[PDB]
PDB file of C-alpha atoms and ligand atoms in Angstrom:
ATOM      1  CA  UNK A   1       0.574  -0.269  -0.033  1.00  0.00           C
ATOM      2  CA  UNK A   2       0.780   3.483  -0.644  1.00  0.00           C
ATOM      3  CA  UNK A   3       0.187   6.563  -2.115  1.00  0.00           C
ATOM      4  CA  UNK A   4       1.597  10.521  -2.542  1.00  0.00           C
ATOM      5  CA  UNK A   5       0.305  13.122  -1.446  1.00  0.00           C
ATOM      6  CA  UNK A   6       0.303  16.411  -3.379  1.00  0.00           C
ATOM      7  CA  UNK A   7      -1.708  20.409  -3.308  1.00  0.00           C
ATOM      8  CA  UNK A   8      -4.795  18.614  -3.245  1.00  0.00           C
ATOM      9  CA  UNK A   9      -4.412  15.325  -4.849  1.00  0.00           C
ATOM     10  CA  UNK A  10      -3.958  11.721  -3.824  1.00  0.00           C
ATOM     11  CA  UNK A  11      -1.996   9.041  -6.858  1.00  0.00           C
ATOM     12  CA  UNK A  12      -2.600   5.416  -5.522  1.00  0.00           C
ATOM     13  CA  UNK A  13      -2.123   1.713  -7.583  1.00  0.00           C
ATOM     14  CA  UNK A  14      -5.567   1.997  -9.696  1.00  0.00           C
ATOM     15  CA  UNK A  15      -5.858  -1.618  -8.374  1.00  0.00           C
ATOM     16  CA  UNK A  16      -5.619  -0.555  -4.858  1.00  0.00           C
ATOM     17  CA  UNK A  17      -8.664   2.669  -4.955  1.00  0.00           C
ATOM     18  CA  UNK A  18     -11.116   2.812  -2.632  1.00  0.00           C
ATOM     19  CA  UNK A  19     -14.790   4.230  -2.847  1.00  0.00           C
ATOM     20  CA  UNK A  20     -13.661   7.315  -1.150  1.00  0.00           C
ATOM     21  CA  UNK A  21     -11.253   7.995  -4.370  1.00  0.00           C
ATOM     22  CA  UNK A  22     -13.311   6.289  -7.052  1.00  0.00           C
ATOM     23  CA  UNK A  23     -15.747   8.858  -6.001  1.00  0.00           C
ATOM     24  CA  UNK A  24     -13.763  11.731  -5.399  1.00  0.00           C
ATOM     25  CA  UNK A  25     -12.230  10.997  -9.031  1.00  0.00           C
ATOM     26  CA  UNK A  26     -10.219  13.187 -11.142  1.00  0.00           C
ATOM     27  CA  UNK A  27      -7.916  10.895 -13.337  1.00  0.00           C
ATOM     28  CA  UNK A  28      -7.308   6.765 -14.046  1.00  0.00           C
ATOM     29  CA  UNK A  29      -5.549   5.037 -16.165  1.00  0.00           C
ATOM     30  CA  UNK A  30      -5.462   1.202 -16.637  1.00  0.00           C
ATOM     31  CA  UNK A  31      -2.757   0.723 -18.534  1.00  0.00           C
ATOM     32  CA  UNK A  32      -0.400   2.627 -16.516  1.00  0.00           C
ATOM     33  CA  UNK A  33      -2.185   1.546 -12.712  1.00  0.00           C
ATOM     34  CA  UNK A  34      -2.986   4.832 -11.895  1.00  0.00           C
ATOM     35  CA  UNK A  35      -5.369   6.662 -10.209  1.00  0.00           C
ATOM     36  CA  UNK A  36      -6.107   9.671  -9.268  1.00  0.00           C
ATOM     37  CA  UNK A  37      -8.020  11.506  -6.392  1.00  0.00           C
ATOM     38  CA  UNK A  38      -8.260  14.698  -4.848  1.00  0.00           C
ATOM     39  CA  UNK A  39      -8.062  15.712  -1.037  1.00  0.00           C
ATOM     40  CA  UNK A  40      -9.700  18.423   1.631  1.00  0.00           C
ATOM     41  CA  UNK A  41      -6.186  18.334   3.123  1.00  0.00           C
ATOM     42  CA  UNK A  42      -3.446  19.354   1.428  1.00  0.00           C
ATOM     43  CA  UNK A  43      -0.001  17.307   0.777  1.00  0.00           C
ATOM     44  CA  UNK A  44       3.243  17.667   1.538  1.00  0.00           C
ATOM     45  CA  UNK A  45       5.382  15.931  -1.917  1.00  0.00           C
ATOM     46  CA  UNK A  46       6.990  17.458  -4.273  1.00  0.00           C
ATOM     47  CA  UNK A  47       6.779  16.107  -7.651  1.00  0.00           C
ATOM     48  CA  UNK A  48      10.689  15.372  -9.530  1.00  0.00           C
ATOM     49  CA  UNK A  49      10.806  17.245 -13.222  1.00  0.00           C
ATOM     50  CA  UNK A  50      14.123  15.682 -14.626  1.00  0.00           C
ATOM     51  CA  UNK A  51      15.522  12.396 -16.227  1.00  0.00           C
ATOM     52  CA  UNK A  52      17.081  11.352 -13.563  1.00  0.00           C
ATOM     53  CA  UNK A  53      17.203   6.946 -13.710  1.00  0.00           C
ATOM     54  CA  UNK A  54      18.714   6.239  -9.935  1.00  0.00           C
ATOM     55  CA  UNK A  55      16.741   6.848  -7.339  1.00  0.00           C
ATOM     56  CA  UNK A  56      15.483   5.378  -3.591  1.00  0.00           C
ATOM     57  CA  UNK A  57      12.502   3.184  -2.822  1.00  0.00           C
ATOM     58  CA  UNK A  58      10.707   1.922   0.124  1.00  0.00           C
ATOM     59  CA  UNK A  59      10.043  -1.588   0.016  1.00  0.00           C
ATOM     60  CA  UNK A  60       7.767  -2.633   3.102  1.00  0.00           C
ATOM     61  CA  UNK A  61       8.132  -6.017   3.349  1.00  0.00           C
ATOM     62  CA  UNK A  62      11.738  -5.078   4.577  1.00  0.00           C
ATOM     63  CA  UNK A  63      10.358  -2.031   6.764  1.00  0.00           C
ATOM     64  CA  UNK A  64      13.945  -0.890   4.091  1.00  0.00           C
ATOM     65  CA  UNK A  65      14.015   2.091   1.197  1.00  0.00           C
ATOM     66  CA  UNK A  66      16.563   1.020  -0.785  1.00  0.00           C
ATOM     67  CA  UNK A  67      19.129   2.616  -3.284  1.00  0.00           C
ATOM     68  CA  UNK A  68      18.937   2.452  -7.298  1.00  0.00           C
ATOM     69  CA  UNK A  69      19.406   2.586 -11.292  1.00  0.00           C
ATOM     70  CA  UNK A  70      15.852   1.899 -13.156  1.00  0.00           C
ATOM     71  CA  UNK A  71      15.398   2.355 -17.221  1.00  0.00           C
ATOM     72  CA  UNK A  72      13.372   5.010 -18.575  1.00  0.00           C
ATOM     73  CA  UNK A  73       9.594   4.822 -18.692  1.00  0.00           C
ATOM     74  CA  UNK A  74       8.441   2.073 -21.355  1.00  0.00           C
ATOM     75  CA  UNK A  75       6.093   0.249 -22.346  1.00  0.00           C
ATOM     76  CA  UNK A  76       6.918  -3.248 -21.095  1.00  0.00           C
ATOM     77  CA  UNK A  77       4.734  -6.890 -20.530  1.00  0.00           C
ATOM     78  CA  UNK A  78       3.271  -7.617 -17.047  1.00  0.00           C
ATOM     79  CA  UNK A  79       2.679 -10.923 -16.150  1.00  0.00           C
ATOM     80  CA  UNK A  80      -1.161 -12.054 -15.198  1.00  0.00           C
ATOM     81  CA  UNK A  81      -2.462 -11.018 -11.752  1.00  0.00           C
ATOM     82  CA  UNK A  82      -5.589 -11.183  -8.969  1.00  0.00           C
ATOM     83  CA  UNK A  83      -5.945  -8.169 -10.091  1.00  0.00           C
ATOM     84  CA  UNK A  84      -4.668  -7.470 -14.075  1.00  0.00           C
ATOM     85  CA  UNK A  85      -4.264 -10.687 -17.024  1.00  0.00           C
ATOM     86  CA  UNK A  86      -1.804 -10.787 -19.134  1.00  0.00           C
ATOM     87  CA  UNK A  87      -1.134  -7.201 -21.275  1.00  0.00           C
ATOM     88  CA  UNK A  88       1.189  -4.392 -21.329  1.00  0.00           C
ATOM     89  CA  UNK A  89       2.041  -1.654 -19.371  1.00  0.00           C
ATOM     90  CA  UNK A  90       2.563   1.996 -20.062  1.00  0.00           C
ATOM     91  CA  UNK A  91       4.433   4.011 -18.013  1.00  0.00           C
ATOM     92  CA  UNK A  92       6.553   1.924 -16.276  1.00  0.00           C
ATOM     93  CA  UNK A  93      11.107   1.708 -14.756  1.00  0.00           C
ATOM     94  CA  UNK A  94      11.822  -1.300 -13.754  1.00  0.00           C
ATOM     95  CA  UNK A  95      14.537  -2.295 -11.392  1.00  0.00           C
ATOM     96  CA  UNK A  96      16.455  -4.482  -9.499  1.00  0.00           C
ATOM     97  CA  UNK A  97      15.650  -5.070  -5.680  1.00  0.00           C
ATOM     98  CA  UNK A  98      13.226  -6.294  -3.742  1.00  0.00           C
ATOM     99  CA  UNK A  99       9.461  -6.375  -4.151  1.00  0.00           C
ATOM    100  CA  UNK A 100       6.356  -8.263  -3.155  1.00  0.00           C
ATOM    101  CA  UNK A 101       2.848  -8.289  -4.382  1.00  0.00           C
ATOM    102  CA  UNK A 102       2.022  -5.793  -1.545  1.00  0.00           C
ATOM    103  CA  UNK A 103       5.088  -3.420  -2.028  1.00  0.00           C
ATOM    104  CA  UNK A 104       2.781  -1.496  -4.414  1.00  0.00           C
ATOM    105  CA  UNK A 105       2.890   1.907  -3.695  1.00  0.00           C
ATOM    106  CA  UNK A 106       5.832   2.075  -2.204  1.00  0.00           C
ATOM    107  CA  UNK A 107       7.865   6.041  -2.893  1.00  0.00           C
ATOM    108  CA  UNK A 108      10.249   6.026  -5.930  1.00  0.00           C
ATOM    109  CA  UNK A 109      12.681   8.759  -5.946  1.00  0.00           C
ATOM    110  CA  UNK A 110      15.370  10.663  -6.489  1.00  0.00           C
ATOM    111  CA  UNK A 111      16.865  14.675  -5.521  1.00  0.00           C
ATOM    112  CA  UNK A 112      13.987  16.517  -7.337  1.00  0.00           C
ATOM    113  CA  UNK A 113      11.374  14.342  -5.400  1.00  0.00           C
ATOM    114  CA  UNK A 114       9.201  12.262  -6.181  1.00  0.00           C
ATOM    115  CA  UNK A 115       9.900   9.830  -9.177  1.00  0.00           C
ATOM    116  CA  UNK A 116       6.956   7.214  -8.767  1.00  0.00           C
ATOM    117  CA  UNK A 117       4.946   4.720  -6.993  1.00  0.00           C
ATOM    118  CA  UNK A 118       6.189   0.085  -6.886  1.00  0.00           C
ATOM    119  CA  UNK A 119       3.511  -0.940  -9.908  1.00  0.00           C
ATOM    120  CA  UNK A 120       5.263  -4.780 -10.652  1.00  0.00           C
ATOM    121  CA  UNK A 121       8.098  -6.724  -9.876  1.00  0.00           C
ATOM    122  CA  UNK A 122       8.690 -10.926  -9.088  1.00  0.00           C
ATOM    123  CA  UNK A 123      12.070 -12.511  -8.753  1.00  0.00           C
ATOM    124  CA  UNK A 124      14.458  -9.637  -7.300  1.00  0.00           C
ATOM    125  CA  UNK A 125      12.868  -7.024  -9.719  1.00  0.00           C
ATOM    126  CA  UNK A 126      10.768  -4.159  -8.804  1.00  0.00           C
ATOM    127  CA  UNK A 127       9.290  -1.961 -11.617  1.00  0.00           C
ATOM    128  CA  UNK A 128       7.186   1.220 -11.128  1.00  0.00           C
ATOM    129  CA  UNK A 129       4.761   4.090 -12.188  1.00  0.00           C
ATOM    130  CA  UNK A 130       5.860   6.848 -13.254  1.00  0.00           C
ATOM    131  CA  UNK A 131       4.577  10.213 -13.110  1.00  0.00           C
ATOM    132  CA  UNK A 132       7.150  13.080 -14.089  1.00  0.00           C
ATOM    133  CA  UNK A 133       5.313  13.537 -16.956  1.00  0.00           C
ATOM    134  CA  UNK A 134       1.663  14.345 -14.947  1.00  0.00           C
ATOM    135  CA  UNK A 135       2.596  17.936 -15.287  1.00  0.00           C
ATOM    136  CA  UNK A 136      -1.100  18.840 -13.352  1.00  0.00           C
ATOM    137  CA  UNK A 137      -0.133  17.715 -10.654  1.00  0.00           C
ATOM    138  CA  UNK A 138       2.029  21.071  -9.379  1.00  0.00           C
ATOM    139  CA  UNK A 139      -1.192  22.633 -10.733  1.00  0.00           C
TER     140      UNK A 139
HETATM  141  C1  LIG B   1       5.621  -5.659  -6.803  1.00  0.00           C
HETATM  142  O1  LIG B   1       4.413  -6.375  -7.592  1.00  0.00           O
HETATM  143  C2  LIG B   1       4.752  -7.530  -7.644  1.00  0.00           C
HETATM  144  C3  LIG B   1       6.570  -8.015  -6.773  1.00  0.00           C
HETATM  145  C4  LIG B   1       5.870  -9.730  -6.725  1.00  0.00           C
HETATM  146  C5  LIG B   1       5.796 -11.051  -7.633  1.00  0.00           C
HETATM  147  C6  LIG B   1       4.750 -10.363  -8.756  1.00  0.00           C
HETATM  148  C7  LIG B   1       4.484  -9.358  -8.253  1.00  0.00           C
HETATM  149  C8  LIG B   1       3.382  -8.071  -9.115  1.00  0.00           C
HETATM  150  C9  LIG B   1       2.231  -8.076  -9.189  1.00  0.00           C
HETATM  151  O2  LIG B   1       1.477  -8.795  -8.175  1.00  0.00           O
HETATM  152  N1  LIG B   1       1.271  -6.995  -9.512  1.00  0.00           N
HETATM  153  C10 LIG B   1       1.772  -6.277 -11.119  1.00  0.00           C
HETATM  154  C11 LIG B   1       0.132  -5.459 -11.027  1.00  0.00           C
HETATM  155  C12 LIG B   1       0.389  -4.351 -11.987  1.00  0.00           C
HETATM  156  N2  LIG B   1       0.620  -3.172 -12.529  1.00  0.00           N
HETATM  157  O3  LIG B   1      -0.330  -5.050 -13.404  1.00  0.00           O
HETATM  158  C13 LIG B   1      -0.853  -5.560 -10.567  1.00  0.00           C
HETATM  159  C14 LIG B   1      -0.280  -6.632  -8.486  1.00  0.00           C
HETATM  160  C15 LIG B   1      -0.877  -7.783  -8.399  1.00  0.00           C
HETATM  161  C16 LIG B   1      -0.283  -6.081  -7.404  1.00  0.00           C
HETATM  162 ZN1   ZN B   2      14.984  13.336 -10.641  1.00  0.00          ZN
END
């Protein structure tokens, strides 16, 4: 689990969105595994606007933050899971790092701010849904 709280937005994995998220929906995209809802309170996270390929992510299954090198946002084939059939997921970045299914939502960050959230993984890999291209999160 986990979310980004920037301005009056809450960014979560679409597969983990609650009823309140759907009832306060701003934007969702199944192909990216992302959903954004509106919040009453202002958040403290800032979004990175950069092309960093190194950063640090939070892994809840280890209660630890790890440094990682990650690929550029791309279209990658993701195996079938309890929440989606096998399909191509867009705007996904891959890295070598530990992950388990419930690690989804953990933040990946760089020197500039939040880069994205854990969305996929397995066998010593971890994938992150990028949010750096969503410029509207800043206003
Ligand atoms: C962090 O993901 C994993 C880690 C280890 C093993 C397997 C996974 C992948 C996984 O379980 N996925 C991929 C998600 C997606 N974005 O399609 C949907 C979801 C069920 C939760
Ligand atoms: Zn950066």
